[PDB]
Design a protein around this ligand. Sequence first.
Ligand code: NAD
Ligand code: GTP
Ligand code: GTP
Ligand code: ATP
Ligand code: IMP
Lengths: 81, 481
Amino acid sequence: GYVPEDGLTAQQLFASADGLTYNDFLILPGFIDFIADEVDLTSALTRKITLKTPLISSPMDTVTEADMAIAMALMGGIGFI
Amino acid sequence: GYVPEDGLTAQQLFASADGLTYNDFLILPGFIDFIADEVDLTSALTRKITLKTPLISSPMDTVTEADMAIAMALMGGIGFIHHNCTPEFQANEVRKVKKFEQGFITDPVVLSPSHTVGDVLEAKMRHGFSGIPITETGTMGSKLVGIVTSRDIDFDHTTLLSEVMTPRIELVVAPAGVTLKEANEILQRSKKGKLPIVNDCDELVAIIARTDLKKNRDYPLASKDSQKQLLCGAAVGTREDDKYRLDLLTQAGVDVIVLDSSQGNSVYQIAMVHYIKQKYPHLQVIGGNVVTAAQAKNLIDAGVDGLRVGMGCGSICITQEVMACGRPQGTAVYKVAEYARRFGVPIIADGGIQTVGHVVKALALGASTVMMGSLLAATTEAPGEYFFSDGVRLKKYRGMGSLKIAQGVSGSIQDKGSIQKFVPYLIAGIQHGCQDIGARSLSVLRSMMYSGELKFEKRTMSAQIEGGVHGLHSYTFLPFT
Ligand SMILES: NC(=O)c1ccc[n+]([C@@H]2O[C@H](COP(=O)([O-])OP(=O)(O)OC[C@H]3O[C@@H](n4cnc5c(N)ncnc54)[C@H](O)[C@@H]3O)[C@@H](O)[C@H]2O)c1
Ligand SMILES: Nc1nc2c(ncn2[C@@H]2O[C@H](COP(=O)(O)OP(=O)(O)OP(=O)(O)O)[C@@H](O)[C@H]2O)c(=O)[nH]1
Ligand SMILES: Nc1nc2c(ncn2[C@@H]2O[C@H](COP(=O)(O)OP(=O)(O)OP(=O)(O)O)[C@@H](O)[C@H]2O)c(=O)[nH]1
Ligand SMILES: Nc1ncnc2c1ncn2[C@@H]1O[C@H](COP(=O)(O)OP(=O)(O)OP(=O)(O)O)[C@@H](O)[C@H]1O
Ligand SMILES: O=c1[nH]cnc2c1ncn2[C@@H]1O[C@H](COP(=O)(O)O)[C@@H](O)[C@H]1O
């Protein structure tokens, strides 16, 4: 009835100061009891503004003229000029 | 008289959570007092099934049509049939894998003596089974009339079949209700190749054929169940419509199923194990890919008879880099095989295996068997075609997640020739490395694992750049493939 805890918790990784990046670690799998597209994504951008999706286009000249702002705001995100 | 212990024991490696893989460590050598090919390789697949060799072929579409299942079950291993095709096709595949060698042949093709001999040729092309018993009504519940054979078909073909078949008076036969060891001797001492079996009423009940005895000398390590026929496995998915697929596979006589999924722990999968083990009590079941003991509890509690471990480690996958979710293969196999050992289920390692050394490392860590993908692609009996590229004979290697999102790639592997020579090279390079380790059997090897007698060391990246090194101008390997 007992199963050993495996894997470093969130805080135990970034205690030893090796300066990890997204490439350096994995997230262990859990239990599944819902359909893959049931899950919610609503996320705050700033205190008063919320977006239906966590994606933002970067304000670089080579990424965001108005046509991207439109096409990304139309799908949850936000666009910075 | 004292010699210091050198090297980390089994448990001391995976305590410091660096997430080691098969490349990150070595196994220190022991003492040798046996010949390189003396050792046993007998290994459990599931609670009730044992194999004379730890090799398993992957259930990918690009690896396991029936011809590989045959050619690897014939050499100790077992073969799982890919599931991404219509249930009727998959049932035919597992049926013609079961029927390649036989004890008492119980549904032979039989013809009535009024058939045209050109219909024997049609049936021979339809099945491949070239010698055929003849009975009156033309089914399995009639009196013997004779046998027609390929040695009765060399001479258009419009003749009635009674003219050419051998008469029952001259045909030697054995009485029914005889065990498969007296009928075998009665064939051997009455040296004609297709001995039938008839009851006292002189009606057909079974037949046996000399080539099945010949195959038992030629392939002595083959894995055959009680009825003396090859063992076969099906992958099946977890979806509602695979509940229909299950019955077609079970009517075809499959003996193991693997509940194929990316992440084994789901409520859909745990409910599927219950449905299988309640409806079909005989079938052994293997659980979907697990990487941590905290999810191997739900699978064993469900009732699964074995587990396959590892997710997102593999040649063909891109699943870590899409899902963010996974675990390094070397840590996973040990950290779940130690736990699953208590309840007495076999872990089977799965993919990320690309050399014989990785096979030995995966067996000396807890895995009862190792499941091969890329290392069996482009062998002769892997399905498909040899599309010559820029100076290379190579064959397809498609990941199932490679065409809602795509979580595997689609690529190619260079030709490796017949699996019939490749599997003995793996066997002879496994036991020859188990000799250097110092273990007389794989059971002894995992006892050494769990007793602390085996000792590992970590290998820096600077020490992975070793063997076949950058100091050569150019080189050629030359294994026996
Ligand atoms: N890359 C890998 O990790 C890997 C390994 C082996 C096989 N596969 C193959 O790729 C696919 C991976 O997806 P999967 O393993 O989740 O199986 P799947 O393809 O059947 O599942 C598809 C999706 O629907 C869900 N699903 C599964 N069974 C369900 C059910 N009964 N009812 C409702 N939803 C269900 C899953 O959560 C998943 O999001 C499989 O079809 C398998 O053939 C992938
Ligand atoms: N495909 C198929 N094979 C069967 C069937 N029943 C038995 N066999 C097997 O087919 C194999 C070949 O049978 P044989 O009768 O020896 O074939 P053969 O052509 O007469 O003899 P060979 O030329 O030596 O192959 C044996 O292993 C049989 O057990 C069947 O219905 N279909
Ligand atoms: N007809 C037939 N006989 C076989 C086949 N395989 C093995 N036999 C023989 O049938 C008999 C079966 O007895 P078993 O006690 O099951 O044989 P075994 O000792 O397990 O020997 P193996 O099956 O060879 O490992 C033996 O004489 C075997 O050699 C087969 O596919 N067909
Ligand atoms: N038990 C038997 N008793 C008598 N005749 C048989 C018996 N079994 C087969 N025959 C007949 O004897 C001849 C050869 O039988 P055999 O068993 O050697 O055929 P086969 O092994 O299939 O021949 P081949 O391998 O050359 O194609 C054929 O005419 C065949 O019909
Ligand atoms: O993306 C993938 N899709 C399907 N199966 C995969 C994938 N990646 C690896 N595998 C699994 O791992 C094995 C393939 O071994 P590999 O060739 O070493 O990667 C198979 O037996 C599968 O269970």
